[PDB]
Amino acid sequence: MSISISYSTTYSGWTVADYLADWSAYFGDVNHRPGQVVDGSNTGGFNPGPFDGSQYALKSTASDAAFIAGGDLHYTLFSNPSHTLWGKLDSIALGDTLTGGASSGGYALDSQEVSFSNLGLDSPIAQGRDGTVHKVVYGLMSGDSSALQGQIDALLKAVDPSLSINSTFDQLAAAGVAHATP
């Protein structure tokens, strides 16, 4: 099946692009870069882990913002090509207050704002950091939602060419693609 969106009633009138720019700015940058991963505060984590699973989750350094990437995900760590997220990305959940982890049976958000599901993205290991899955998720880590925006846009176009990243969540609901939280 094709892209499926969940949205808080708050954002009914908001556009997906406007939402993502404010989200990404609110989440900020955890500075997950060479020489800047010196402890556990900015790694995120995998479920089940240690470097592969059905979820990768990360919370903001600055705020209570967090995201959960869902799929069948893999991370090379120090192995060539190094520091590459690859695999199937099915979903991206954005919201507040990450709970849980590997030891409690999964990551969760207390307050989900928006989620994008059935993304159908799939990157092979050998593509390295140029893979779409890596760029999408690493962008969210870095306070840049661009790659994710582009991919959401393309998927929406394919459902109905009047739909885009610049559509309202309400508009997307009218087209069969999104649903507000009751």
Automatic annotation (TrEMBL):
Coiled coil: none annotated. Keywords: Heme, Iron, Metal-binding. It comes from the Bacteria. Heme b 2 binds at residues 75, 83, 129, 138. Heme b 3 binds at residues 75, 129. Transmembrane segments: none annotated. Pfam families: HasA. Heme b 1 binds at residues 32, 35, 75. SUPFAM superfamilies: Heme-binding protein A (HasA). Heme binds at residues 32, 75. GO terms for molecular function: metal ion binding. This is Heme acquisition protein HasAp.
